Scaffold this active site. Structure first.
Site, mmCIF file in Angstrom:
data_model
loop_
_atom_site.group_PDB
_atom_site.id
_atom_site.type_symbol
_atom_site.label_atom_id
_atom_site.label_comp_id
_atom_site.label_asym_id
_atom_site.label_seq_id
_atom_site.Cartn_x
_atom_site.Cartn_y
_atom_site.Cartn_z
ATOM 1 N N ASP A 8 -6.733 0.887 -18.318
ATOM 2 C CA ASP A 8 -7.234 0.185 -17.289
ATOM 3 C C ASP A 8 -6.413 0.181 -15.858
ATOM 4 O OD1 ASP A 8 -9.853 -1.122 -18.766
ATOM 5 O OD2 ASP A 8 -7.978 -1.704 -19.946
ATOM 6 N N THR A 62 0.934 -1.318 -0.006
ATOM 7 C CA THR A 62 0.064 0.075 -0.251
ATOM 8 C C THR A 62 0.861 1.303 0.018
ATOM 9 O OG1 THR A 62 -0.292 -0.197 2.359
ATOM 10 C CG2 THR A 62 -1.656 -1.256 1.120
ATOM 11 N N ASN A 64 4.815 3.753 -25.227
ATOM 12 C CA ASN A 64 5.705 4.670 -24.819
ATOM 13 C C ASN A 64 5.960 5.999 -25.662
ATOM 14 O OD1 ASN A 64 6.359 2.258 -23.012
ATOM 15 N ND2 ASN A 64 8.157 1.796 -24.374
ATOM 16 N N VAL A 105 -9.706 -5.541 -23.770
ATOM 17 C CA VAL A 105 -8.526 -5.907 -23.156
ATOM 18 C C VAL A 105 -8.031 -5.000 -21.977
ATOM 19 C CG1 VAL A 105 -7.840 -7.168 -25.366
ATOM 20 C CG2 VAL A 105 -6.815 -4.987 -24.812
ATOM 21 N N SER A 147 6.168 -2.047 -21.721
ATOM 22 C CA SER A 147 6.223 -3.431 -22.022
ATOM 23 C C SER A 147 6.841 -3.840 -20.878
ATOM 24 C CB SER A 147 7.394 -3.564 -22.916
ATOM 25 O OG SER A 147 7.234 -3.245 -24.074
ATOM 26 N N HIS A 166 14.216 -8.989 -25.183
ATOM 27 C CA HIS A 166 12.831 -8.287 -24.704
ATOM 28 C C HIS A 166 11.814 -9.383 -24.229
ATOM 29 C CE1 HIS A 166 8.908 -6.106 -25.336
ATOM 30 N NE2 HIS A 166 9.867 -5.077 -25.250
ATOM 31 N N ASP A 198 -3.021 7.120 -5.785
ATOM 32 C CA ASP A 198 -1.654 7.305 -5.287
ATOM 33 C C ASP A 198 -0.395 7.672 -6.424
ATOM 34 O OD1 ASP A 198 -2.425 6.713 -2.688
ATOM 35 O OD2 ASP A 198 -2.302 4.483 -3.254
ATOM 36 N N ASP A 203 6.025 -12.060 -28.096
ATOM 37 C CA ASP A 203 7.094 -11.183 -28.145
ATOM 38 C C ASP A 203 8.001 -11.792 -29.032
ATOM 39 O OD1 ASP A 203 9.144 -9.282 -26.849
ATOM 40 O OD2 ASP A 203 7.442 -8.807 -25.560
HETATM 41 CA CA LIG Z 1 -9.917 -2.186 -21.010
#
Ligand SMILES: [Ca+2]
Length: 279
Positions: free
Chosen positions: A200, A16, A161, A177, A224, A69, A260, A39
């Protein structure tokens, strides 16, 4: 369970508060779940994977990760030291070449592959797919991500990015998604993280230590890196029976640390992935 001197992102996901260094999680650790890492591949022989990783598909001359990656992302999902879900099964699908590039048609084929291939795997606790990749808006790419999700796979995708609205990128912009932005160890939105209404959730994405090719490790940054934190978190929660592939993104948002993060643009969720694990 407690992992001392954990990477900051693992500690963050079970805390937290920022500024701690121990990762706390239920010992079930994603056992019986599966995560596909779509990937550049996964160096499955890395000691960090303990025989729990394997390549299941490539579209190129080798299934080996010649980049690093995919291995790094897979390590954040499920490696023994660097992973969120330390007992999950990891499946590599190499849609990106060793330069980290891939045609959308290949990426789409890889998503439809996972939707079918899960039926050839043992994942009694459920199935996750982590997509640390993206390009410009494409309805066909979004549709493929939507199909994968619809098929019963928890799909987590990088917001991108570009320090821009993720609405203009795919599969980030697919609403169905779980679109993941990046934060840093001081709870700031990462400098490069995309934002917007389509996000999200945020996960740790700046200076993330994980596995690399040649049996190595390194720290790198990106949405990523945030994405596999969320993918591993989903697998872990699904193993606990707390959520399902269809509902995991919502559950993660419901149970996130709220309000936060700093430098979150007005209209973007201020939600940081959190496992709510209490010993
Ligand atoms: Ca979504």
């Amino acid at each position: 369970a407690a992992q001392t001197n954990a990477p900051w992102g693992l500690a963050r996901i079970s805390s937290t508060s920022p500024g701690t260094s121990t990762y706390y999680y239920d010992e079930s650790a994603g056992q019986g779940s599966c995560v596909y890492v779509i990937d550049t591949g996964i160096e499955a022989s890395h000691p960090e994977f303990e025989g729990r990783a394997q390549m299941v598909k490539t579209y190129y001359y080798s299934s080996r990760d010649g980049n690093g990656h995919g291995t790094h992302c897979a390590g954040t999902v499920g490696s023994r030291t660097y992973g969120v879900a330390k007992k999950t099964q990891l499946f590599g699908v190499k849609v990106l070449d060793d330069n980290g590039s891939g045609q959308y048609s290949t990426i789409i084929a890889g998503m439809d592959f996972v939707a079918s291939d899960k039926n050839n795997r043992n994942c009694p606790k459920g199935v996750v797919a982590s997509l640390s990749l993206g390009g410009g808006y494409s309805s066909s790419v979004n549709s493929a991500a939507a199909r994968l999700q619809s098929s019963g796979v928890m799909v987590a995708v990088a917001a991108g990015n570009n320090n821009a609205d993720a609405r203009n990128y795919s599969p980030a912009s697919e609403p169905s998604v779980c679109t993941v932005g990046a934060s840093d160890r001081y709870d700031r939105r990462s400098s490069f993280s995309n934002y917007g209404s389509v996000l999200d959730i945020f996960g740790p994405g700046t200076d993330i230590l994980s596995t690399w090719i040649g049996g190595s490790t390194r720290s790198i940054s990106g949405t990523s890196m945030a994405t596999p934190h969320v993918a591993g978190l989903a697998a872990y929660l699904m193993t606990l029976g707390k959520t399902t592939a269809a509902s995991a993104c919502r559950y993660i948002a419901d149970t996130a640390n709220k309000g936060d993060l700093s430098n979150i643009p007005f209209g973007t969720v201020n939600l940081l992935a959190y496992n709510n694990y209490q010993a």
